[PDB]
Design a protein around this ligand. Structure first.
Ligand code: G3A
Ligand code: SAH
Length: 260
């Protein structure tokens, strides 16, 4: 059993008051007051982020931890926060975005965020059974939390396998993908094998809530996997009892318009 396995059990053992005090303490959170209601009322002329994912991918790129360029594929795009971010980047030429949609899952939000015309959204698509195709950059933000750590580990392993398939088709592709439960031994093993073939490493973004152990894998960085996960598990355990709240920051506004 890992330190992160312990963290998950301690999290599940929290009272509701302990859970509410823990989940957001010390984390960056974008101010979504205006974006949330523009999306609810169906406004489509807006460049404010459609989801909290946009700021996370922006942080990774600004840190230099991901390379977004060329033909981008967004696997499990949900509302599309990563697709709209990639579409606004000058080095990106097009985005093919796929997501399952349907009951309980998010469909793409349709807005005129800068470069929207370069995105081809396809909902109703299961990326785990879809044949890979050409891509310069492969992005995947898939991983639904579960109180059951074995389920989180299985969901994570499926994403790593998916990324191996896309790398087999595109050995030179830049990759960035969510690793929902890096604290599971079977995820660490699958990640180590990915690293030995393709390079890369793991990083925690400051927007992730303390109630999730999610980290992001990118071929553009390096680092011992076991050390990265353990450092993060210690940080998550250290925040139990912290009284500070979230740090509020402005939401990303990409502006509106086409790219040609
Ligand atoms: N001690 C608690 N831990 C919680 C709780 N809610 C979530 N969590 C943990 O955070 C993890 C991430 O939570 P997330 O950000 O995805 O929030 P959600 O509400 O969308 O997660 P769900 O699992 O779908 O929650 C649905 C209901 O499940 C309840 N729930 C979920 N886990 C718990 C636990 N462990 N104890 C008590 N109640 C729990 C929770 O109150 C909700 O009413 C989750 O997997 C759990 O390990 C919680 O209420 N109490
Ligand atoms: N097998 C699958 N095939 C396609 N989409 C899937 C999938 N499994 C989960 N998904 C979708 O993947 C999404 C991951 S969350 C998407 C967040 C996105 N990066 C943003 O910034 O908005 C969810 O909407 C889920 O419905």
């Amino acid at each position: 059993m890992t330190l992160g396995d312990l963290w998950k059990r301690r999290l599940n053992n929290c009272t509701k008051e302990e859970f509410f005090a823990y989940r957001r303490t010390g984390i960056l959170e974008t101010e979504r007051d205006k974006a949330r209601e523009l999306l609810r009322k169906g406004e489509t002329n807006m460049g404010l982020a459609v989801s909290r994912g946009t700021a996370k991918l922006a942080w990774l790129e600004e840190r230099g931890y991901v390379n977004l360029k060329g033909e981008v594929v967004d696997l499990g795009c949900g509302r599309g926060g990563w697709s709209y971010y990639a579409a606004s980047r000058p080095a990106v030429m097009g985005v093919k975005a796929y997501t399952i949609g349907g009951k309980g899952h998010e469909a793409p939000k349709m807005v005129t965020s800068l470069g929207w015309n370069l995105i081809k959204f396809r909902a109703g698509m299961d990326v785990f059974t879809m044949q890979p195709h050409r891509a310069d950059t492969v992005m995947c933000d898939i991983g639904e939390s579960s109180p059951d750590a074995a389920i989180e580990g299985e969901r994570t392993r499926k994403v790593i396998l998916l990324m191996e398939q896309w790398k087999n088709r595109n050995p030179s592709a830049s990759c960035v993908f969510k690793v929902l439960a890096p604290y599971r031994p079977e995820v660490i093993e699958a990640l180590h094998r990915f690293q030995l073939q393709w390079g890369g490493g793991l990083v925690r973004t400051p927007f992730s809530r303390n109630s999730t152990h999610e980290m992001y894998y990118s071929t553009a960085i390096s680092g011992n996997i076991v050390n990265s996960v353990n450092v993060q598990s210690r940080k998550l355990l250290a925040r139990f009892g912290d009284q500070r709240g979230p740090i509020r920051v402005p939401e990303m506004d990409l502006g509106v318009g086409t790219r040609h």
